């Protein structure tokens, strides 16, 4: 037979994600010292659409 | 077919060399031992890659095997082998045929 589509999806040639429009990885603040002994106050500058 | 368990028959025992009494058994094939040169060669050939390297028979046609009686002389304990024709049923136990009977 032939290599089937779900097999082909793993070589990641045309099946990689389209990451151009994205705004970055959405990750928490790193767990440094304040997040586990006190708190730290940040400000929500903007709320945006991530493609 | 019914064969008696005893038989007067020639024994070439070098001590009898004449007709003597023999006990009669059926011959059993005997276990195919390892370390026989043929099995050793077969195992060596089958080791590795290449699959089955010799032929395995499939087209069986015979429905009976030839029976071999083993005749153990009761005098000198010399053994002899003799085959009969092909039979579906073979009995060594003697239950003689009786003519003047009903059923």
């Amino acid at each position: 037979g032939r290599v089937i589509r779900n097999q082909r999806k793993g070589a990641g040639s045309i099946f990689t994600s389209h990451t151009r429009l994205r705004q970055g990885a959405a990750k928490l603040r790193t767990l440094d010292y304040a997040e586990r002994h006190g708190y730290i106050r940040g400000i929500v500058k903007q709320i945006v659409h991530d493609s | 077919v019914n064969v008696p368990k005893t038989r007067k028959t020639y024994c070439k025992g070098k001590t009898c060399r004449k007709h003597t009494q023999h006990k009669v058994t059926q011959y059993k094939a005997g276990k195919a031992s390892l370390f026989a040169q043929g099995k050793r060669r077969y195992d060596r050939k089958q080791s590795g890659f290449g699959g089955q390297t010799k032929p395995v028979f499939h087209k069986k046609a015979k429905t009976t095997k030839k029976v071999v009686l083993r005749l153990e002389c009761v005098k000198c304990k010399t053994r002899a082998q003799l085959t009969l024709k092909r039979c579906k049923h073979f009995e060594l136990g003697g239950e003689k045929k009786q003519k003047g009977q009903a059923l």
Partner: protein
């Protein structure tokens, strides 16, 4: 709707899967097309119930 070269389901004179579409977890790549390691199939009468 493919040919048998393209998929386990392809081919036939009618569009049918042919063999059971529930595939073993121990299957291989190229075999794992369908319902992988399905405990049950068909329409289920129930809710998630967490």
């Amino acid at each position: 709707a493919m040919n048998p070269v393209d998929h386990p389901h392809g081919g036939g004179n009618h569009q049918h899967i042919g063999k059971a579409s529930t595939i073993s977890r121990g299957a291989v790549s190229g075999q794992k097309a369908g319902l992988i390691a399905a405990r049950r199939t068909g329409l289920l009468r129930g809710s998630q119930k967490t």
